[PDB]
Amino acid sequence: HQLQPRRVSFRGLQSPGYDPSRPESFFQQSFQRLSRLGHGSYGEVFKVRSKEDGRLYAVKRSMSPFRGPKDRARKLAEVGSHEKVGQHPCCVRLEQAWEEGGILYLQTELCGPSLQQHCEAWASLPEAQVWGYLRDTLLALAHLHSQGLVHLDVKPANIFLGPRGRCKLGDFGLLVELGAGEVQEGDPRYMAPELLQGSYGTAADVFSLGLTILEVACNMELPHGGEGWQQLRQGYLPPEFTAGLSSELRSVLVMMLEPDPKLRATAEALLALPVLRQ
Ligand SMILES: Cc1ccc(O)c(C)c1-c1cc(-c2ccnc(N3CC[C@@H](N)C3)c2)cc(C(N)=O)c1N
């Protein structure tokens, strides 16, 4: 026998068309699986339609049952972090989460391709689009920081194309609160230099978003270490990466890539620039 699905929430499961008497899972009974959006060691993401309301969503499920109470605690923690983010037009919105059969499910709004996928199936993007992605993801960071939260893995793969040129930031598994809480290793290509010393704060996201946007704007791989990695963290843009970048975009990126986090521009300061108006 199998225990009924349980809602996972850190704030305070039954749905139309779900029958506990029937053997198959809440996920099998309550959704129509339409396509697979992604698969990895983190599990799988599916595009689904909900039987409850008839609308499209995405559902991420973990790959293997919990191995022990700590493994379970650490996986469920993602839901608590995501709930702290809440509703914001530039953040992937969690609808509900649940556990069944030792598997964790997160149901969110359905978003488009990641910025990474969008780039791969474009070369270098029109700068007008890049400005939109930068602005939207800056709004997301201002929102996170207002909640005392820092995303420690801002990267092209974690930003999803919404409606009409809009970007939403997601994957809040590596969110920390301003103690910190347990966290995994962010992608070294986009890592703020102060994180080498374990120092973090709202500035670390801004730096990562700077290299995220640099990468999508120039369509070149960033170094994961060695001299190239250091030379992106000196306070200038290496010419290697700047071919075809406008003077306007270059200047905003260099504000975001300031190595001293005390000097680095805040999301709100960047959003107040005339170039990022509206
Ligand atoms: C379901 C879910 C729950 C919580 C959450 O925060 C997010 C973002 C999602 C979510 C994830 C994905 C997706 C697709 C392919 N690869 C990845 N990953 C690659 C590695 C990892 N970092 C990110 C993620 C797509 C969508 C979407 N298109 O609607 C989506 N809403």
PDB file of C-alpha atoms and ligand atoms in Angstrom:
ATOM      1  CA  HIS A   1       0.000   0.000   0.000  1.00  0.00           C
ATOM      2  CA  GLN A   2       0.986   3.612  -0.678  1.00  0.00           C
ATOM      3  CA  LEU A   3       0.308   6.715   1.424  1.00  0.00           C
ATOM      4  CA  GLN A   4      -1.858   9.427  -0.177  1.00  0.00           C
ATOM      5  CA  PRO A   5      -0.079  12.443  -1.702  1.00  0.00           C
ATOM      6  CA  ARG A   6       0.678  15.182   0.803  1.00  0.00           C
ATOM      7  CA  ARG A   7       0.831  18.918   0.013  1.00  0.00           C
ATOM      8  CA  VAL A   8       4.230  20.435   0.696  1.00  0.00           C
ATOM      9  CA  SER A   9       4.141  23.976   2.068  1.00  0.00           C
ATOM     10  CA  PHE A  10       6.007  25.962   4.683  1.00  0.00           C
ATOM     11  CA  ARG A  11       3.226  28.498   5.233  1.00  0.00           C
ATOM     12  CA  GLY A  12       0.367  26.779   7.090  1.00  0.00           C
ATOM     13  CA  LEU A  13      -4.011  16.759  -1.163  1.00  0.00           C
ATOM     14  CA  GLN A  14      -7.423  16.707  -2.817  1.00  0.00           C
ATOM     15  CA  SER A  15      -8.540  18.046  -6.173  1.00  0.00           C
ATOM     16  CA  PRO A  16     -11.416  17.653  -8.675  1.00  0.00           C
ATOM     17  CA  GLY A  17     -10.798  14.474 -10.662  1.00  0.00           C
ATOM     18  CA  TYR A  18      -8.390  12.914  -8.156  1.00  0.00           C
ATOM     19  CA  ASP A  19      -9.663   9.697  -6.587  1.00  0.00           C
ATOM     20  CA  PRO A  20      -7.586   8.272  -3.674  1.00  0.00           C
ATOM     21  CA  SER A  21      -9.399   4.928  -4.166  1.00  0.00           C
ATOM     22  CA  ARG A  22      -7.800   4.539  -7.592  1.00  0.00           C
ATOM     23  CA  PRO A  23      -4.245   3.135  -7.633  1.00  0.00           C
ATOM     24  CA  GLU A  24      -2.412   5.620  -9.860  1.00  0.00           C
ATOM     25  CA  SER A  25      -0.679   8.777  -8.664  1.00  0.00           C
ATOM     26  CA  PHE A  26      -2.021  12.266  -8.180  1.00  0.00           C
ATOM     27  CA  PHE A  27       0.284  13.323 -11.034  1.00  0.00           C
ATOM     28  CA  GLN A  28      -1.105  10.602 -13.363  1.00  0.00           C
ATOM     29  CA  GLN A  29      -4.747  11.305 -12.425  1.00  0.00           C
ATOM     30  CA  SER A  30      -4.760  15.126 -12.239  1.00  0.00           C
ATOM     31  CA  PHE A  31      -2.713  16.025 -15.328  1.00  0.00           C
ATOM     32  CA  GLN A  32      -2.341  15.213 -18.963  1.00  0.00           C
ATOM     33  CA  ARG A  33       1.346  14.920 -19.856  1.00  0.00           C
ATOM     34  CA  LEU A  34       1.994  16.822 -23.105  1.00  0.00           C
ATOM     35  CA  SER A  35       5.783  16.896 -23.586  1.00  0.00           C
ATOM     36  CA  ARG A  36       9.030  16.628 -21.670  1.00  0.00           C
ATOM     37  CA  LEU A  37      10.817  19.960 -21.261  1.00  0.00           C
ATOM     38  CA  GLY A  38      13.887  18.700 -19.478  1.00  0.00           C
ATOM     39  CA  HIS A  39      15.542  15.763 -17.772  1.00  0.00           C
ATOM     40  CA  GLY A  40      18.667  15.447 -15.649  1.00  0.00           C
ATOM     41  CA  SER A  41      19.815  14.164 -12.270  1.00  0.00           C
ATOM     42  CA  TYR A  42      17.431  16.784 -10.830  1.00  0.00           C
ATOM     43  CA  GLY A  43      14.587  14.733 -12.310  1.00  0.00           C
ATOM     44  CA  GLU A  44      12.229  15.695 -15.095  1.00  0.00           C
ATOM     45  CA  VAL A  45      10.108  18.645 -16.160  1.00  0.00           C
ATOM     46  CA  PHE A  46       6.876  18.112 -18.104  1.00  0.00           C
ATOM     47  CA  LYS A  47       4.503  20.438 -19.904  1.00  0.00           C
ATOM     48  CA  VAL A  48       1.043  19.404 -18.661  1.00  0.00           C
ATOM     49  CA  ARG A  49      -2.613  20.346 -18.776  1.00  0.00           C
ATOM     50  CA  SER A  50      -4.432  20.409 -15.449  1.00  0.00           C
ATOM     51  CA  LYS A  51      -7.645  18.441 -15.050  1.00  0.00           C
ATOM     52  CA  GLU A  52      -8.675  20.817 -12.277  1.00  0.00           C
ATOM     53  CA  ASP A  53      -8.840  24.010 -14.364  1.00  0.00           C
ATOM     54  CA  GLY A  54      -7.933  22.981 -17.923  1.00  0.00           C
ATOM     55  CA  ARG A  55      -4.912  25.273 -18.096  1.00  0.00           C
ATOM     56  CA  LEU A  56      -1.295  24.611 -19.076  1.00  0.00           C
ATOM     57  CA  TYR A  57       1.431  24.293 -16.410  1.00  0.00           C
ATOM     58  CA  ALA A  58       4.883  22.840 -15.924  1.00  0.00           C
ATOM     59  CA  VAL A  59       5.614  20.111 -13.370  1.00  0.00           C
ATOM     60  CA  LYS A  60       9.027  19.160 -12.084  1.00  0.00           C
ATOM     61  CA  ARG A  61       9.370  15.831 -10.345  1.00  0.00           C
ATOM     62  CA  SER A  62      12.400  14.437  -8.612  1.00  0.00           C
ATOM     63  CA  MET A  63      14.153  11.423 -10.118  1.00  0.00           C
ATOM     64  CA  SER A  64      14.345   8.989  -7.194  1.00  0.00           C
ATOM     65  CA  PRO A  65      12.596   8.472  -3.849  1.00  0.00           C
ATOM     66  CA  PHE A  66      13.961  10.219  -0.747  1.00  0.00           C
ATOM     67  CA  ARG A  67      16.912   8.269   0.695  1.00  0.00           C
ATOM     68  CA  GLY A  68      16.443   9.411   4.292  1.00  0.00           C
ATOM     69  CA  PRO A  69      14.923  12.215   6.416  1.00  0.00           C
ATOM     70  CA  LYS A  70      17.729  14.716   5.630  1.00  0.00           C
ATOM     71  CA  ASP A  71      17.546  14.092   1.891  1.00  0.00           C
ATOM     72  CA  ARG A  72      13.802  14.659   2.114  1.00  0.00           C
ATOM     73  CA  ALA A  73      14.248  17.841   4.198  1.00  0.00           C
ATOM     74  CA  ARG A  74      16.743  19.240   1.686  1.00  0.00           C
ATOM     75  CA  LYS A  75      14.562  18.523  -1.319  1.00  0.00           C
ATOM     76  CA  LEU A  76      11.418  19.954   0.290  1.00  0.00           C
ATOM     77  CA  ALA A  77      13.356  23.106   1.200  1.00  0.00           C
ATOM     78  CA  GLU A  78      13.144  24.214  -2.442  1.00  0.00           C
ATOM     79  CA  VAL A  79       9.392  24.643  -1.970  1.00  0.00           C
ATOM     80  CA  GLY A  80       9.924  26.849   1.090  1.00  0.00           C
ATOM     81  CA  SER A  81      12.383  29.008  -0.863  1.00  0.00           C
ATOM     82  CA  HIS A  82      10.023  29.223  -3.836  1.00  0.00           C
ATOM     83  CA  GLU A  83       7.135  30.161  -1.572  1.00  0.00           C
ATOM     84  CA  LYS A  84       9.266  33.007  -0.183  1.00  0.00           C
ATOM     85  CA  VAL A  85       9.506  34.366  -3.750  1.00  0.00           C
ATOM     86  CA  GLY A  86       5.718  34.295  -4.182  1.00  0.00           C
ATOM     87  CA  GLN A  87       3.967  36.100  -7.053  1.00  0.00           C
ATOM     88  CA  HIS A  88       5.956  38.479  -9.245  1.00  0.00           C
ATOM     89  CA  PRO A  89       5.646  38.956 -13.032  1.00  0.00           C
ATOM     90  CA  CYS A  90       9.397  38.319 -13.514  1.00  0.00           C
ATOM     91  CA  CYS A  91       9.643  35.218 -11.305  1.00  0.00           C
ATOM     92  CA  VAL A  92       8.422  31.709 -12.124  1.00  0.00           C
ATOM     93  CA  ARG A  93       5.275  31.278 -10.008  1.00  0.00           C
ATOM     94  CA  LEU A  94       4.725  28.138  -7.933  1.00  0.00           C
ATOM     95  CA  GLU A  95       1.121  26.921  -8.033  1.00  0.00           C
ATOM     96  CA  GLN A  96       1.406  23.971  -5.612  1.00  0.00           C
ATOM     97  CA  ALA A  97       3.814  21.216  -4.562  1.00  0.00           C
ATOM     98  CA  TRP A  98       3.255  17.742  -3.177  1.00  0.00           C
ATOM     99  CA  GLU A  99       5.034  14.542  -2.289  1.00  0.00           C
ATOM    100  CA  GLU A 100       3.894  11.055  -3.220  1.00  0.00           C
ATOM    101  CA  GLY A 101       5.783   7.781  -3.213  1.00  0.00           C
ATOM    102  CA  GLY A 102       8.904   9.585  -1.969  1.00  0.00           C
ATOM    103  CA  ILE A 103       8.854  11.856  -5.050  1.00  0.00           C
ATOM    104  CA  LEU A 104       8.621  15.650  -4.860  1.00  0.00           C
ATOM    105  CA  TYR A 105       6.506  17.513  -7.426  1.00  0.00           C
ATOM    106  CA  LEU A 106       6.487  21.266  -8.092  1.00  0.00           C
ATOM    107  CA  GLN A 107       3.765  22.622 -10.303  1.00  0.00           C
ATOM    108  CA  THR A 108       4.407  26.075 -11.724  1.00  0.00           C
ATOM    109  CA  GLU A 109       3.094  28.348 -14.421  1.00  0.00           C
ATOM    110  CA  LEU A 110       4.212  27.224 -17.896  1.00  0.00           C
ATOM    111  CA  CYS A 111       6.997  29.352 -19.338  1.00  0.00           C
ATOM    112  CA  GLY A 112       8.738  29.352 -22.709  1.00  0.00           C
ATOM    113  CA  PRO A 113      12.311  28.248 -23.556  1.00  0.00           C
ATOM    114  CA  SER A 114      15.191  29.227 -21.358  1.00  0.00           C
ATOM    115  CA  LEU A 115      17.456  32.017 -22.533  1.00  0.00           C
ATOM    116  CA  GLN A 116      20.050  29.310 -23.085  1.00  0.00           C
ATOM    117  CA  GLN A 117      17.760  27.431 -25.492  1.00  0.00           C
ATOM    118  CA  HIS A 118      16.622  30.666 -27.109  1.00  0.00           C
ATOM    119  CA  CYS A 119      20.236  31.580 -27.859  1.00  0.00           C
ATOM    120  CA  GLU A 120      21.139  28.141 -29.149  1.00  0.00           C
ATOM    121  CA  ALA A 121      18.337  28.210 -31.704  1.00  0.00           C
ATOM    122  CA  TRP A 122      18.665  31.817 -32.808  1.00  0.00           C
ATOM    123  CA  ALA A 123      23.721  33.158 -32.965  1.00  0.00           C
ATOM    124  CA  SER A 124      23.824  36.587 -31.266  1.00  0.00           C
ATOM    125  CA  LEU A 125      20.498  38.152 -30.272  1.00  0.00           C
ATOM    126  CA  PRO A 126      19.167  41.560 -31.411  1.00  0.00           C
ATOM    127  CA  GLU A 127      20.175  43.993 -28.674  1.00  0.00           C
ATOM    128  CA  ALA A 128      16.616  45.270 -28.226  1.00  0.00           C
ATOM    129  CA  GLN A 129      15.712  41.796 -26.923  1.00  0.00           C
ATOM    130  CA  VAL A 130      18.748  41.650 -24.639  1.00  0.00           C
ATOM    131  CA  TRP A 131      17.761  44.962 -23.027  1.00  0.00           C
ATOM    132  CA  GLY A 132      14.328  43.451 -22.273  1.00  0.00           C
ATOM    133  CA  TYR A 133      15.845  40.342 -20.676  1.00  0.00           C
ATOM    134  CA  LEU A 134      18.214  42.454 -18.609  1.00  0.00           C
ATOM    135  CA  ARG A 135      15.406  44.728 -17.399  1.00  0.00           C
ATOM    136  CA  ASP A 136      13.012  41.902 -16.500  1.00  0.00           C
ATOM    137  CA  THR A 137      15.632  39.896 -14.658  1.00  0.00           C
ATOM    138  CA  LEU A 138      16.720  43.063 -12.805  1.00  0.00           C
ATOM    139  CA  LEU A 139      13.080  43.451 -11.651  1.00  0.00           C
ATOM    140  CA  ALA A 140      13.264  39.845 -10.425  1.00  0.00           C
ATOM    141  CA  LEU A 141      16.455  40.580  -8.463  1.00  0.00           C
ATOM    142  CA  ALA A 142      14.975  43.730  -6.890  1.00  0.00           C
ATOM    143  CA  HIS A 143      12.036  41.577  -5.846  1.00  0.00           C
ATOM    144  CA  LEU A 144      14.263  38.816  -4.392  1.00  0.00           C
ATOM    145  CA  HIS A 145      16.415  41.275  -2.501  1.00  0.00           C
ATOM    146  CA  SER A 146      13.274  42.901  -1.017  1.00  0.00           C
ATOM    147  CA  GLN A 147      12.471  39.502   0.427  1.00  0.00           C
ATOM    148  CA  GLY A 148      16.007  39.229   1.825  1.00  0.00           C
ATOM    149  CA  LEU A 149      16.812  36.561  -0.775  1.00  0.00           C
ATOM    150  CA  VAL A 150      19.808  35.951  -3.021  1.00  0.00           C
ATOM    151  CA  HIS A 151      19.773  33.674  -6.068  1.00  0.00           C
ATOM    152  CA  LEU A 152      23.124  32.010  -6.191  1.00  0.00           C
ATOM    153  CA  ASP A 153      22.750  30.559  -9.690  1.00  0.00           C
ATOM    154  CA  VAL A 154      21.558  33.214 -12.116  1.00  0.00           C
ATOM    155  CA  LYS A 155      22.462  31.913 -15.584  1.00  0.00           C
ATOM    156  CA  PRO A 156      20.908  31.622 -19.077  1.00  0.00           C
ATOM    157  CA  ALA A 157      19.442  28.193 -18.248  1.00  0.00           C
ATOM    158  CA  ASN A 158      17.466  29.602 -15.300  1.00  0.00           C
ATOM    159  CA  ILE A 159      15.731  32.451 -17.124  1.00  0.00           C
ATOM    160  CA  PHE A 160      12.613  31.610 -19.089  1.00  0.00           C
ATOM    161  CA  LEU A 161      10.977  33.481 -21.918  1.00  0.00           C
ATOM    162  CA  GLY A 162       7.481  34.598 -20.998  1.00  0.00           C
ATOM    163  CA  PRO A 163       4.877  36.481 -23.025  1.00  0.00           C
ATOM    164  CA  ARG A 164       5.983  39.129 -25.563  1.00  0.00           C
ATOM    165  CA  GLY A 165       9.706  39.538 -24.937  1.00  0.00           C
ATOM    166  CA  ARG A 166       9.364  39.079 -21.172  1.00  0.00           C
ATOM    167  CA  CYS A 167      11.894  37.012 -19.036  1.00  0.00           C
ATOM    168  CA  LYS A 168      11.150  35.164 -15.770  1.00  0.00           C
ATOM    169  CA  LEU A 169      13.821  34.033 -13.322  1.00  0.00           C
ATOM    170  CA  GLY A 170      13.387  30.521 -11.908  1.00  0.00           C
ATOM    171  CA  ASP A 171      14.987  27.531 -10.152  1.00  0.00           C
ATOM    172  CA  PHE A 172      14.937  28.717  -6.584  1.00  0.00           C
ATOM    173  CA  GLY A 173      16.706  25.638  -5.284  1.00  0.00           C
ATOM    174  CA  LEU A 174      19.869  27.755  -4.874  1.00  0.00           C
ATOM    175  CA  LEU A 175      18.212  30.710  -3.215  1.00  0.00           C
ATOM    176  CA  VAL A 176      19.656  31.756   0.152  1.00  0.00           C
ATOM    177  CA  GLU A 177      18.184  34.072   2.748  1.00  0.00           C
ATOM    178  CA  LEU A 178      20.132  37.019   4.199  1.00  0.00           C
ATOM    179  CA  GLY A 179      21.357  31.883   8.745  1.00  0.00           C
ATOM    180  CA  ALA A 180      22.017  31.290   5.044  1.00  0.00           C
ATOM    181  CA  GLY A 181      20.832  27.689   4.820  1.00  0.00           C
ATOM    182  CA  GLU A 182      22.247  24.750   2.861  1.00  0.00           C
ATOM    183  CA  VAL A 183      23.051  25.337  -0.822  1.00  0.00           C
ATOM    184  CA  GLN A 184      24.666  23.646  -3.853  1.00  0.00           C
ATOM    185  CA  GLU A 185      27.471  24.893  -6.124  1.00  0.00           C
ATOM    186  CA  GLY A 186      26.485  27.645  -8.612  1.00  0.00           C
ATOM    187  CA  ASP A 187      27.912  27.570 -12.160  1.00  0.00           C
ATOM    188  CA  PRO A 188      31.474  28.895 -11.927  1.00  0.00           C
ATOM    189  CA  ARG A 189      31.184  30.727 -15.249  1.00  0.00           C
ATOM    190  CA  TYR A 190      28.808  33.284 -13.708  1.00  0.00           C
ATOM    191  CA  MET A 191      30.029  33.296 -10.134  1.00  0.00           C
ATOM    192  CA  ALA A 192      30.763  36.616  -8.368  1.00  0.00           C
ATOM    193  CA  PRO A 193      34.398  36.751  -7.271  1.00  0.00           C
ATOM    194  CA  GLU A 194      33.573  37.285  -3.581  1.00  0.00           C
ATOM    195  CA  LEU A 195      31.869  33.831  -3.436  1.00  0.00           C
ATOM    196  CA  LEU A 196      35.322  32.235  -3.591  1.00  0.00           C
ATOM    197  CA  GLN A 197      35.667  33.420   0.007  1.00  0.00           C
ATOM    198  CA  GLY A 198      32.128  32.350   0.823  1.00  0.00           C
ATOM    199  CA  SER A 199      30.956  35.961   0.936  1.00  0.00           C
ATOM    200  CA  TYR A 200      27.540  36.637  -0.471  1.00  0.00           C
ATOM    201  CA  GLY A 201      24.888  39.296  -0.524  1.00  0.00           C
ATOM    202  CA  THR A 202      22.485  40.980  -2.885  1.00  0.00           C
ATOM    203  CA  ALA A 203      25.380  42.061  -5.038  1.00  0.00           C
ATOM    204  CA  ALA A 204      26.326  38.493  -6.011  1.00  0.00           C
ATOM    205  CA  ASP A 205      23.176  38.118  -8.188  1.00  0.00           C
ATOM    206  CA  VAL A 206      23.804  41.339  -9.979  1.00  0.00           C
ATOM    207  CA  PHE A 207      27.281  40.163 -10.977  1.00  0.00           C
ATOM    208  CA  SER A 208      25.931  36.807 -12.214  1.00  0.00           C
ATOM    209  CA  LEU A 209      23.224  38.568 -14.232  1.00  0.00           C
ATOM    210  CA  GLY A 210      25.922  40.757 -15.749  1.00  0.00           C
ATOM    211  CA  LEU A 211      27.843  37.739 -17.087  1.00  0.00           C
ATOM    212  CA  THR A 212      24.567  36.039 -18.060  1.00  0.00           C
ATOM    213  CA  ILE A 213      23.646  38.974 -20.240  1.00  0.00           C
ATOM    214  CA  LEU A 214      27.209  39.337 -21.496  1.00  0.00           C
ATOM    215  CA  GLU A 215      27.131  35.726 -22.626  1.00  0.00           C
ATOM    216  CA  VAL A 216      23.782  35.900 -24.419  1.00  0.00           C
ATOM    217  CA  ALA A 217      24.633  39.233 -26.041  1.00  0.00           C
ATOM    218  CA  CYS A 218      28.009  38.104 -27.460  1.00  0.00           C
ATOM    219  CA  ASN A 219      27.166  34.390 -27.988  1.00  0.00           C
ATOM    220  CA  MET A 220      30.528  33.151 -26.672  1.00  0.00           C
ATOM    221  CA  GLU A 221      31.339  30.622 -23.952  1.00  0.00           C
ATOM    222  CA  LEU A 222      32.594  32.178 -20.707  1.00  0.00           C
ATOM    223  CA  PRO A 223      35.614  30.578 -19.004  1.00  0.00           C
ATOM    224  CA  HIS A 224      34.946  28.268 -16.050  1.00  0.00           C
ATOM    225  CA  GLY A 225      38.354  28.980 -14.478  1.00  0.00           C
ATOM    226  CA  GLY A 226      41.968  29.947 -15.105  1.00  0.00           C
ATOM    227  CA  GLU A 227      43.258  33.252 -16.420  1.00  0.00           C
ATOM    228  CA  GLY A 228      40.175  33.964 -18.536  1.00  0.00           C
ATOM    229  CA  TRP A 229      37.970  33.633 -15.467  1.00  0.00           C
ATOM    230  CA  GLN A 230      40.117  36.081 -13.523  1.00  0.00           C
ATOM    231  CA  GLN A 231      40.213  38.585 -16.377  1.00  0.00           C
ATOM    232  CA  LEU A 232      36.405  38.868 -16.382  1.00  0.00           C
ATOM    233  CA  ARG A 233      36.649  39.874 -12.721  1.00  0.00           C
ATOM    234  CA  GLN A 234      38.995  42.870 -12.931  1.00  0.00           C
ATOM    235  CA  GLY A 235      36.523  45.647 -13.637  1.00  0.00           C
ATOM    236  CA  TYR A 236      36.801  45.848 -17.422  1.00  0.00           C
ATOM    237  CA  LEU A 237      35.293  43.973 -20.360  1.00  0.00           C
ATOM    238  CA  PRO A 238      37.804  41.948 -22.325  1.00  0.00           C
ATOM    239  CA  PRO A 239      37.555  42.950 -26.028  1.00  0.00           C
ATOM    240  CA  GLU A 240      37.160  39.235 -26.858  1.00  0.00           C
ATOM    241  CA  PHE A 241      33.552  39.469 -25.608  1.00  0.00           C
ATOM    242  CA  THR A 242      32.518  42.937 -26.742  1.00  0.00           C
ATOM    243  CA  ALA A 243      32.496  42.735 -30.520  1.00  0.00           C
ATOM    244  CA  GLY A 244      29.182  44.121 -31.692  1.00  0.00           C
ATOM    245  CA  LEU A 245      28.045  45.256 -28.250  1.00  0.00           C
ATOM    246  CA  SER A 246      26.720  48.811 -28.179  1.00  0.00           C
ATOM    247  CA  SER A 247      28.486  51.388 -26.040  1.00  0.00           C
ATOM    248  CA  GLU A 248      25.270  51.653 -24.009  1.00  0.00           C
ATOM    249  CA  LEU A 249      25.131  47.966 -23.177  1.00  0.00           C
ATOM    250  CA  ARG A 250      28.833  47.778 -22.432  1.00  0.00           C
ATOM    251  CA  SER A 251      28.600  50.558 -19.854  1.00  0.00           C
ATOM    252  CA  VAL A 252      25.717  48.965 -17.973  1.00  0.00           C
ATOM    253  CA  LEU A 253      27.473  45.592 -17.972  1.00  0.00           C
ATOM    254  CA  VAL A 254      30.656  47.110 -16.530  1.00  0.00           C
ATOM    255  CA  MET A 255      28.583  48.603 -13.694  1.00  0.00           C
ATOM    256  CA  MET A 256      27.257  45.116 -12.939  1.00  0.00           C
ATOM    257  CA  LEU A 257      30.671  43.456 -13.165  1.00  0.00           C
ATOM    258  CA  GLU A 258      32.449  45.617 -10.575  1.00  0.00           C
ATOM    259  CA  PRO A 259      34.580  43.112  -8.579  1.00  0.00           C
ATOM    260  CA  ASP A 260      34.153  44.879  -5.238  1.00  0.00           C
ATOM    261  CA  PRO A 261      30.637  44.028  -4.152  1.00  0.00           C
ATOM    262  CA  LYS A 262      30.452  47.192  -1.988  1.00  0.00           C
ATOM    263  CA  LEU A 263      30.934  49.268  -5.123  1.00  0.00           C
ATOM    264  CA  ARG A 264      28.790  47.173  -7.468  1.00  0.00           C
ATOM    265  CA  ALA A 265      25.534  48.767  -8.700  1.00  0.00           C
ATOM    266  CA  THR A 266      22.321  47.599  -6.998  1.00  0.00           C
ATOM    267  CA  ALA A 267      19.408  46.251  -9.032  1.00  0.00           C
ATOM    268  CA  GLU A 268      17.362  49.311  -8.133  1.00  0.00           C
ATOM    269  CA  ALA A 269      20.161  51.668  -9.129  1.00  0.00           C
ATOM    270  CA  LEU A 270      20.412  49.959 -12.514  1.00  0.00           C
ATOM    271  CA  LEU A 271      16.627  50.050 -12.970  1.00  0.00           C
ATOM    272  CA  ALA A 272      16.724  53.834 -12.313  1.00  0.00           C
ATOM    273  CA  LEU A 273      19.044  54.459 -15.305  1.00  0.00           C
ATOM    274  CA  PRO A 274      17.386  56.326 -18.204  1.00  0.00           C
ATOM    275  CA  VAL A 275      18.443  53.490 -20.513  1.00  0.00           C
ATOM    276  CA  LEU A 276      16.344  51.007 -18.539  1.00  0.00           C
ATOM    277  CA  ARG A 277      13.254  53.204 -18.156  1.00  0.00           C
ATOM    278  CA  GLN A 278       9.850  51.600 -18.809  1.00  0.00           C
TER     279      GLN A 278
HETATM  280  C1  LIG B   1       8.639  23.034 -13.269  1.00  0.00           C
HETATM  281  C2  LIG B   1       9.498  24.071 -12.502  1.00  0.00           C
HETATM  282  C3  LIG B   1       9.432  24.111 -11.141  1.00  0.00           C
HETATM  283  C4  LIG B   1      10.195  25.048 -10.407  1.00  0.00           C
HETATM  284  C5  LIG B   1      11.037  25.954 -11.109  1.00  0.00           C
HETATM  285  O1  LIG B   1      11.804  26.911 -10.365  1.00  0.00           O
HETATM  286  C6  LIG B   1      11.098  25.919 -12.476  1.00  0.00           C
HETATM  287  C7  LIG B   1      11.993  26.904 -13.215  1.00  0.00           C
HETATM  288  C8  LIG B   1      10.334  24.985 -13.195  1.00  0.00           C
HETATM  289  C9  LIG B   1      10.490  24.931 -14.713  1.00  0.00           C
HETATM  290  C10 LIG B   1      11.667  24.300 -15.183  1.00  0.00           C
HETATM  291  C11 LIG B   1      11.882  24.193 -16.584  1.00  0.00           C
HETATM  292  C12 LIG B   1      13.158  23.555 -17.097  1.00  0.00           C
HETATM  293  C13 LIG B   1      13.265  22.968 -18.346  1.00  0.00           C
HETATM  294  C14 LIG B   1      14.496  22.431 -18.757  1.00  0.00           C
HETATM  295  N1  LIG B   1      15.552  22.524 -17.961  1.00  0.00           N
HETATM  296  C15 LIG B   1      15.508  23.102 -16.777  1.00  0.00           C
HETATM  297  N2  LIG B   1      16.725  23.178 -15.965  1.00  0.00           N
HETATM  298  C16 LIG B   1      17.926  22.847 -16.342  1.00  0.00           C
HETATM  299  C17 LIG B   1      18.699  22.709 -14.995  1.00  0.00           C
HETATM  300  C18 LIG B   1      17.881  23.561 -13.989  1.00  0.00           C
HETATM  301  N3  LIG B   1      18.750  24.594 -13.305  1.00  0.00           N
HETATM  302  C19 LIG B   1      16.951  24.158 -14.692  1.00  0.00           C
HETATM  303  C20 LIG B   1      14.319  23.650 -16.279  1.00  0.00           C
HETATM  304  C21 LIG B   1      10.975  24.733 -17.466  1.00  0.00           C
HETATM  305  C22 LIG B   1       9.837  25.384 -16.992  1.00  0.00           C
HETATM  306  C23 LIG B   1       8.824  25.978 -17.986  1.00  0.00           C
HETATM  307  N4  LIG B   1       9.242  26.150 -19.323  1.00  0.00           N
HETATM  308  O2  LIG B   1       7.671  26.302 -17.648  1.00  0.00           O
HETATM  309  C24 LIG B   1       9.597  25.488 -15.594  1.00  0.00           C
HETATM  310  N5  LIG B   1       8.445  26.131 -15.139  1.00  0.00           N
END
